[PDB]
Curated annotation (Swiss-Prot):
Subunit: Interacts with and forms tight 1:1 complexes with RNH1. Dimerization of two such complexes may occur. Interaction with RNH1 inhibits this protein. Monomer.
Active site: H12 (proton acceptor), H119 (proton donor)
Record function comment: Endonuclease that catalyzes the cleavage of RNA on the 3' side of pyrimidine nucleotides. Acts on single-stranded and double-stranded RNA.
Entry protein name: Ribonuclease pancreatic
Tissue note: Pancreas.
Protein residues bound to substrate: K7, R10, K41, P42, V43, N44, T45, K66, R85
Subcellular localization(s) per the UniProt record: Secreted
Record field: catalytic activity: an [RNA] containing cytidine + H2O = an [RNA]-3'-cytidine-3'-phosphate + a 5'-hydroxy-ribonucleotide-3'-[RNA]; an [RNA] containing uridine + H2O = an [RNA]-3'-uridine-3'-phosphate + a 5'-hydroxy-ribonucleotide-3'-[RNA]
Originating gene: RNASE1
Consequence the record notes for mutating H119A: Loss of activity
Full-protein positions shown: 27 to 150 of 150
Disulfide bonds: C26-C84, C40-C95, C58-C110, C65-C72
């Protein structure tokens, strides 16, 4: 069974390259991370920093999470991210995404030991 920390890395970490070039990054990435298997996951963000940099967010700016828990943290620095958002015409099993590159702060929920990200809350 996938741990919460492992799911976070599968959904949100893309440390291999510093950006999204291809307009088909999201279609490709959403597929290879298993986020088009059963349904089209509508919105998902990928972070293009090192896992060490992202795990360090858990010792940065403590903030509330969207759900009201207080184990969220905002990255002090901006980070390279890609936003994947399903198109208006996307219908499973042919999932379609627009790919948008951005440099923004991330907000993640952290938990467990080691104390690492388990949810992507938002980018700011
Ligand atoms: Pt800022
Ligand atoms: Pt959770």
């Amino acid at each position: 069974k996938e741990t919460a920390a492992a799911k976070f890395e599968r959904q949100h970490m893309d440390s291999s390259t510093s950006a999204a070039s291809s307009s088909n990054y999201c279609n490709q990435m959403m597929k290879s991370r298993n986020l088009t298997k059963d349904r089209c996951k509508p919105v998902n963000t990928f972070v293009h920093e090192s896992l060490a940099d992202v795990q360090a967010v858990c010792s940065q700016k403590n903030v509330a999470c969207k759900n009201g828990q207080t184990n969220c943290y905002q990255s002090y620095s901006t980070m390279s991210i890609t936003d994947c958002r399903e198109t208006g015409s996307s219908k499973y099993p042919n999932c379609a995404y627009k790919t948008t590159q951005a440099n923004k702060h991330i907000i993640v929920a952290c938990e467990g030991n080691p104390y690492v990200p388990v949810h992507f809350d938002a980018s700011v």
